[PDB]
Amino acid sequence: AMMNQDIEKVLISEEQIQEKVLELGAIIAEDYKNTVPLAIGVLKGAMPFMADLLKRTDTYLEMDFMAVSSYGHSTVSTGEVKILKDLDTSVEGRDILIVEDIIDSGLTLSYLVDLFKYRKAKSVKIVTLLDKPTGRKVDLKADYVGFTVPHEFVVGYGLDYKEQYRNLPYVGVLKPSVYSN
Amino acid sequence: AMMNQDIEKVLISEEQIQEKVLELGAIIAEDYKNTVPLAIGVLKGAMPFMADLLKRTDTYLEMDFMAVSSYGHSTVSTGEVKILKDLDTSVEGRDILIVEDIIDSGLTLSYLVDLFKYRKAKSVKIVTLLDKPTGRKVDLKADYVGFTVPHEFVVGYGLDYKEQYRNLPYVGVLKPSVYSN
Amino acid sequence: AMMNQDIEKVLISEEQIQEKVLELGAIIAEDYKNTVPLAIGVLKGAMPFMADLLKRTDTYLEMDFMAVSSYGHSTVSTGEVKILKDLDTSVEGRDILIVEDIIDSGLTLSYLVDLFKYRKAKSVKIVTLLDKPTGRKVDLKADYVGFTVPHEFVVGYGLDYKEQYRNLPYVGVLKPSVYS
Amino acid sequence: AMMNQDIEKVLISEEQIQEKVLELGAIIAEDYKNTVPLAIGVLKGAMPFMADLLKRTDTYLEMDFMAVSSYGHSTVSTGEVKILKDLDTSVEGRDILIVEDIIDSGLTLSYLVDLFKYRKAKSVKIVTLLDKPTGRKVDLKADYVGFTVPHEFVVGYGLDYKEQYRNLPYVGVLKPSVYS
């Protein structure tokens, strides 16, 4: 109730998230019943969603994580990013499931998707909590989507504003007074 | 593919975890009243606990993550580990909170604690879900402890056996038959 | 105990190496006269050759380095490796010159070449000091080659055996008694 | 358009460097004859000096490298840096020799030195080609030094301006027109 002061609107409630997580986890568990997928999230934003989704995914799976950084101009036009932490294990022959917080332009995510394909993954799919198709600067459709949202000015449940608000249990929109700081 | 069938005992149930998470989160929010701490998790095991704990910690805070790997013999004796992913931001002058899944020998965690102190952190504290004090090979006491356990043969809620079972919503103990595989 | 006592014979002497780096540097300086290329070395073995080669290439260029680790089976069969140190700058649109100590199997090197192509490099070329065509496990030809050699268990000038001998100023054949 | 056009003066010729490098190699070879040291370079500037120095050090040794990034304020005030590539092996008990191109403020080098001590290195020593001891922002004395130099804006032999000039075989003073 302390950080809710700064939230103008609760876009996706905790109750909604946990309901959708249960639905998606069961779907994913059924689709991957015949393989042991490698579920990977990109730090930092996807961590809260990845924790909830996977522990409601009742099937055998492995986890891993990547960390990336922007190259600046090149990242905004092509999605190319600097690998700060590569996967612990090889991608070849694995069924990859990328767990993402939001897809807006989709440039960086497309860059990583096709990188894993270059590394000869058996398959690559995406489950994203939020989808903003309005902002696509490349053709990328997620295979599982939690909620479609109109804009990217969202915080909470992993999403930050200047590294804060990631620890909200829901997705919200900040009061404009926050952007003045 | 219900994973419960491999579990011999639910050591710490999901209900217990969420109960303890609410307790700790409120204690931590009060203790870090007058600062913006940097909450740090070491991949991979602390990810589910860090997600739950921080979203029940009603205060301003920043998140970050580290990745480390064993050097072999040296890691088992001194706790020295290879840094694969360093913190995104500097440690100097920050109040560091390390979120851990379990403390057993405590060597690697003690190595990281005194590394942050070498990097001139203002303070360094530890919250761990599980504590196995009978395994200490070094003097190290966590400042926040979820539960005390007798041994380290546990899986679930981030903890793995051969990279599996991290996605259980609870902490359990495997049937011996799975050790035979 | 000295390192030369472990060398059976010299394959390429220091003098011959410096003659070759002088030749290669002049060619590279000519081919890259109208661009600022990104000369990339993969640690650790390419470091001695990359140092000597580039200070004999009288032209504007920039350096960078990558560090990688093996994934085990995938690395030995497809060349896929774990990136520990990615380039400090974006590959898009750059003329990449990979500086290599030796091309034997060529798997990992080919993986990195087509990785830079996936990252939309303007061009990707390789200069290697040594070339063992007999070792290939993938089709890969260097653009600049110092020496083509038959199979010998060589060390020196960046090439190691168990992390030692990299600091020899020449390339020598290791005594079989060392690597039984 | 050639690089020497941008050089106002040659501060340390290639001949001078190699004579001193030869001299440093023999001292280090003697001092470390009874141990296998871990020679560490921090990318990228130390690479040309490290290559020449180590191939003039006739003794058994291993090489490794570290890659670091600046954190901004903390780096220029305490030397704390972001580890991108850590060492490939444990520091505990090793005799560490850090090969450096130049020590000016010494902040980051001092941070890494005491990091290796915290990691229980048996010994940590430094060999630098150049030393500006008047630029120190921390008490740091190099164990081996090539040339002691006043305050100049130098490039070459690993030292860059905006990632260029690293491949000069000599150390030169950059024309003021260039960097302005």
Author numbering:
A (entry chain C), B (entry chain A): 0 to 180
C (entry chain D), D (entry chain B): 0 to 179
From the paper:
HPRT is a purine salvage enzyme that converts purine bases and PRPP to GMP and IMP, which are precursors of the essential nucleotide GTP. HPRT activity was previously found to be inhibited by (p)ppGpp in several bacteria including Bacillus subtilis. To examine the molecular determinants underlying (p)ppGpp regulation of HPRT, we turned to Hpt-1 from the pathogenic bacterium B. anthracis, which pppGpp competitively inhibits similarly to B. subtilis HPRT. We crystallized Hpt-1 with and without ppGpp, and for comparison, we also crystallized Hpt-1 with its two substrates, PRPP and the non-reactive guanine analog 9-deazaguanine.
We next interrogated the effect of (p)ppGpp on the oligomeric state of HPRT using the protein crosslinker dimethyl adipimidate (DMA). Crosslinked apo HPRT was resolved by SDS–PAGE as bands corresponding to monomers, dimers, trimers, or tetramers (lane 2). All but the tetramer is likely formed by incomplete crosslinking, since dynamic light scattering showed apo B. anthracis Hpt-1 to be a homogeneous population with a hydrodynamic radius (RH) consistent with a tetramer in solution.
